[PDB]
Amino acid sequence: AVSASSRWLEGIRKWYYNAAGFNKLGLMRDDTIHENDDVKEAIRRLPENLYDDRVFRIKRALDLSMRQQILPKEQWTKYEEDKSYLEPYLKEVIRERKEREEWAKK
Amino acid sequence: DEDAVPTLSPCRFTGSQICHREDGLPLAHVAIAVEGPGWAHPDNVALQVANAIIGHYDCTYGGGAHLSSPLASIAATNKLCQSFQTFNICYADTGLLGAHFVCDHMSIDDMM
Amino acid sequence: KRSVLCRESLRGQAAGRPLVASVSLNVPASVRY
Amino acid sequence: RNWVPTAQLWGAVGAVGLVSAT
Amino acid sequence: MTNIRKSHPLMKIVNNAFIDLPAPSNISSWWNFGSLLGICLILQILTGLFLAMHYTSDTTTAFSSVTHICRDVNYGWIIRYMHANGASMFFICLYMHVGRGLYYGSYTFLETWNIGVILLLTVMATAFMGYVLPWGQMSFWGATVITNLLSAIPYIGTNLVEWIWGGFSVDKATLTRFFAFHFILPFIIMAIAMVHLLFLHETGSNNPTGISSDVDKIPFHPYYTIKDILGALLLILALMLLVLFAPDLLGDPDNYTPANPLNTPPHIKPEWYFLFAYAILRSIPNKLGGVLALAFSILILALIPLLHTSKQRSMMFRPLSQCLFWALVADLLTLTWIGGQPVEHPYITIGQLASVLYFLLILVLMPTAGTIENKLLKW
Amino acid sequence: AEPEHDHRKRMGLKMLLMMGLLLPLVYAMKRHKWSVLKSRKLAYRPPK
Amino acid sequence: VAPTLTARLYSLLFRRTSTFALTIVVGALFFERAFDQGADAIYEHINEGKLWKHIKHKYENK
Ligand code: HEM
Ligand code: HEM
């Protein structure tokens, strides 16, 4: 029955998004996950463009964290553009795992 | 003399690097050089005799390990490189002088 | 490998005495015609 | 070759070092 | 290979761990504490051996021997003070190392962290015994109070406490034991430190961002050797500023009074490094409940890993986490304040709430905040 | 109580001056080397 | 033209590390002595007549 409440989370979400500074660093959510076993496989399934692109952005952002400088206001990731490009890839990875776990009960 | 304004004005010497990574390529190309003299200079034949010593080597050189240039000998013996070559790039106002080597991704540092 | 896309092609083999002459030298090495 | 010269400065250094240091 | 010094001797290759090791580029200045942590331990050792070279481990002499060290022995005065203040620095550093594990989630290195806790508890044993060494009023009563705390254990405790002391009080036997334990502990520690290094060398360092930096690595030698050296300069500056111009400042305990086995430590307390635990301890009425919750303050650390809730091993991009992280640090500050406080109402009620806060922050608040942040990001 | 009171404070003087020469020097050394990295600039050029 | 003080210093003493060390050995010596002499003086100025050095006169040789 979410019309008021779940059309307003976008506001805390939006507030939160830019609150976490990765925003500023040129980075995108997908590029911030913890690199574990599922995430790895997922990353290994990324097409060359998608994947070279994450490499550049972490290469840009770590560059910046080294120098403690934030990117220009002009050049910052905008919440409206949430490329959850890993999500697709990540999901199955997980999906395949859970199955593999489940098939292993009896 | 109003022509005298050198059209051949020195070019400023800069010790930088430009690294352009492409793990999609099989071998590695490195050109390392320090700045040298122009075309005309006593030091400039002496340099050549010094590059004579280092030499220049290829996958196909018949003498590999018995080459006399210890650089050659070492890449021959230890499969350190595919092909290397010293050069002295003579220009008016400046130069480029050093080696250039091609090798595996796991060999760059020993070659250097 | 060197890209062979344009008009530039001009390789075809036929010399006087020597034909398909391959050399292996102690220093240099190659393949001519 | 250049070793004598260099060994000579290296010998100097150890000397003055002891002398002073010690 | 030929005549590549480093790989030639096998032993010398093992040292390239400090030169040719891939080191993250981006990297707060809170990464020098590790290296400082290790200079500390060498500093103590050195200094220590020297003190041990003129110190006597007996009830009659100990205080005298200390006192002789800082009067008739040449430069025996700085060495000793340097040694005492050293141990404040070693702890100061210690807590910086951990604060960072906590914050950037370095403890994702399951195995490396574990050894860290082991290390951390192993320095604590050493600092607890050495303080006893001089045999001052403070040392004599705190050693009694703390080891007797152990007698809270129901079936054994009592027998135990007596075996530790090697008698029914803390006379010779006890004192001689601490000396020996103090001595060898740090050598045992150094093996551990090195095993610690060993496990970390398999995965590398983490960073502010909290993302892999293999795409961005840097040779340790060129950079980080300079950084470490500079950090050591800053480290040594703090130690000497404190040693040379504020000798006991930090050493709260003024008790330079040989210990008379029947007297009154108005307000007896471990040094700064242990106040948190102390506070924690008083908050419980029952003495066994206090010991367990004294043990848990410190051991809690071994579960952090299993409390991690987010998808971002880096608190850096997570604001609610940052806020509680800091709180707990200030809570922790607050707890150290209680440590020097009289036993009374005001401090009791405060300390009580601060203990609760402290386990809440580590046990329940943070973890929730983790999920919340993850939901906000739609993760 | 503290015999070493005077030596100590003289030492503090020499440790402060010295450290006022080494902290600024060694910081320099640190920027000397690092400069390579901090001055560095990137460029990304896919075939794409 | 002449070499900047640095360049002079450079080509005389730093090119060869053997010379560079030597330098350092000798400067470590010279520097100790001025530092101490200066630094000591400085210190002793701040506590004029406070230190025995200043006060040995009262009970010395009559
Ligand atoms: C490595 C961890 C160490 C820590 C945390 C540590 C800490 C301490 C502390 C806090 C004291 C009390 C001194 C005072 O406040 O009067 C002390 C004393 C002493 N320590 Fe250490 N120390 C360490 C290592 C060593 C080592 C390796 C040795 C010798 C091998 C050593 C030998 C001594 C001796 C003989 C004393 C007694 C004289 C004195 O009070 O200075 N310690 N230590
Ligand atoms: C004797 C005490 C210790 C010594 C000598 C020591 C030494 C070091 C050194 C040299 C480093 C590498 C540089 C750095 O990461 O800062 C390091 C990293 C680390 N230490 Fe320790 N440490 C000690 C105590 C601890 C403690 C008490 C913990 C946690 C309880 C700990 C956990 C870690 C972790 C998690 C890392 C790696 C984090 C990362 O760089 O990603 N260490 N330690």
Coordinates of N, CA, C and O and ligand atoms in Angstrom, one line a residue, chain E residues 41 44-45 48-49 51-52 55 66 69 80 83-84 87 90-91 123 126-127 130-131 133-134 179 182-183 186-187 271 273, ligand 1:
Chain E
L41 N 58.3 -2.2 19.7 CA 58.7 -3.4 20.3 C 60.2 -3.6 20.3 O 60.8 -4.2 21.2
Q44 N 61.5 -1.0 23.2 CA 61.4 -1.6 24.5 C 62.5 -2.6 24.8 O 63.2 -2.5 25.8
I45 N 62.5 -3.7 23.9 CA 63.5 -4.7 24.0 C 64.9 -4.1 24.4 O 65.5 -4.5 25.4
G48 N 65.0 -2.2 27.6 CA 64.7 -3.2 28.5 C 66.0 -4.0 28.9 O 66.4 -3.8 30.1
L49 N 66.6 -4.7 28.0 CA 67.8 -5.5 28.2 C 68.7 -4.6 29.0 O 69.4 -5.1 29.9
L51 N 68.1 -1.8 31.0 CA 67.5 -1.9 32.4 C 67.8 -3.2 33.0 O 68.7 -3.3 33.9
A52 N 67.2 -4.3 32.5 CA 67.6 -5.6 33.1 C 69.1 -5.8 33.3 O 69.5 -6.8 33.9
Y55 N 69.3 -4.2 37.1 CA 68.1 -4.3 37.9 C 68.2 -5.6 38.6 O 68.7 -6.5 38.0
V66 N 66.0 0.0 40.9 CA 65.4 1.0 40.0 C 66.0 2.4 40.2 O 66.5 3.1 39.4
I69 N 69.3 2.8 39.1 CA 69.4 2.9 37.7 C 69.3 4.3 37.3 O 70.2 4.9 36.7
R80 N 65.7 4.3 31.4 CA 64.5 3.9 32.2 C 63.3 4.7 31.8 O 62.4 4.2 31.2
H83 N 62.1 3.8 28.6 CA 61.4 2.5 28.7 C 60.0 2.7 29.2 O 59.1 2.1 28.7
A84 N 59.8 3.4 30.3 CA 58.5 3.6 30.9 C 57.7 4.3 29.8 O 56.6 3.9 29.4
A87 N 56.4 2.4 26.7 CA 55.2 1.6 26.9 C 53.9 2.3 26.8 O 52.8 1.7 26.3
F90 N 53.8 2.5 22.8 CA 53.4 1.1 22.3 C 51.9 0.9 22.4 O 51.3 0.2 21.6
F91 N 51.3 1.5 23.5 CA 49.9 1.3 23.6 C 49.1 2.3 22.8 O 48.3 2.0 22.0
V123 N 50.9 -8.2 24.5 CA 51.6 -7.0 25.0 C 51.0 -6.6 26.4 O 51.8 -6.4 27.3
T126 N 52.6 -8.4 29.3 CA 53.9 -7.8 29.5 C 53.9 -6.5 30.2 O 54.5 -6.4 31.2
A127 N 53.0 -5.6 29.8 CA 52.9 -4.3 30.4 C 52.4 -4.4 31.9 O 52.7 -3.6 32.8
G130 N 55.8 -5.9 34.0 CA 56.8 -4.9 34.1 C 56.5 -3.8 35.1 O 57.3 -3.5 36.0
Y131 N 55.4 -3.2 34.9 CA 55.0 -2.2 35.9 C 55.2 -2.8 37.3 O 55.5 -2.0 38.3
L133 N 57.6 -4.8 38.3 CA 59.0 -4.8 38.5 C 59.7 -3.9 39.5 O 60.5 -4.3 40.3
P134 N 59.5 -2.6 39.4 CA 60.0 -1.6 40.3 C 59.5 -1.8 41.8 O 60.2 -1.4 42.7
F179 N 59.5 -10.8 36.7 CA 60.7 -10.5 35.9 C 61.0 -11.4 34.8 O 61.3 -11.1 33.7
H182 N 58.3 -11.2 31.9 CA 58.4 -9.9 31.3 C 59.5 -10.1 30.3 O 59.3 -9.8 29.1
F183 N 60.6 -10.7 30.7 CA 61.8 -10.9 29.9 C 61.5 -11.7 28.6 O 61.5 -11.1 27.5
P186 N 58.2 -10.7 25.3 CA 58.5 -10.0 24.1 C 59.3 -10.7 23.1 O 59.2 -10.5 21.9
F187 N 60.1 -11.7 23.5 CA 60.8 -12.5 22.4 C 59.8 -13.4 21.8 O 59.8 -13.6 20.6
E271 N 47.4 1.6 34.7 CA 47.7 2.8 33.9 C 46.7 3.0 32.8 O 46.1 2.0 32.3
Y273 N 46.3 2.6 29.7 CA 46.0 1.6 28.8 C 45.0 0.6 29.2 O 44.1 0.1 28.5
Ligands
HEM1 C1 58.1 -5.8 24.8 C2 57.1 -5.4 25.6 C3 57.4 -4.6 26.8 C4 56.6 -3.8 27.5 C5 55.1 -3.4 27.1 C6 57.3 -3.2 28.6 C7 56.8 -2.4 29.5 C8 57.4 -2.1 30.7 C9 56.8 -1.3 31.8 C10 55.5 -0.6 31.5 C11 57.7 -1.2 32.8 C12 57.6 -0.5 34.1 C13 58.7 0.5 34.4 C14 58.2 1.7 35.3 O1 57.1 2.2 35.0 O2 59.0 1.9 36.3 C15 58.8 -2.1 32.5 C16 60.0 -2.3 33.2 C17 61.0 -3.2 32.9 N1 61.2 -3.9 31.7 FE1 59.9 -3.7 30.2 N2 58.6 -3.8 28.6 C18 58.7 -4.6 27.5 C19 59.7 -5.4 27.1 C20 60.8 -5.6 27.9 C21 61.9 -6.4 27.5 C22 62.1 -7.1 26.2 C23 62.8 -6.5 28.6 C24 64.2 -7.2 28.7 C25 64.5 -8.2 27.9 C26 62.2 -5.7 29.6 C27 62.8 -5.4 30.8 C28 62.3 -4.6 31.8 C29 62.9 -4.5 33.1 C30 64.2 -5.1 33.6 C31 62.1 -3.6 33.8 C32 62.3 -3.1 35.3 C33 63.0 -1.7 35.6 C34 62.1 -0.6 35.3 O3 61.1 -0.4 36.0 O4 62.4 0.1 34.2 N3 61.0 -5.2 29.2 N4 58.6 -2.6 31.2

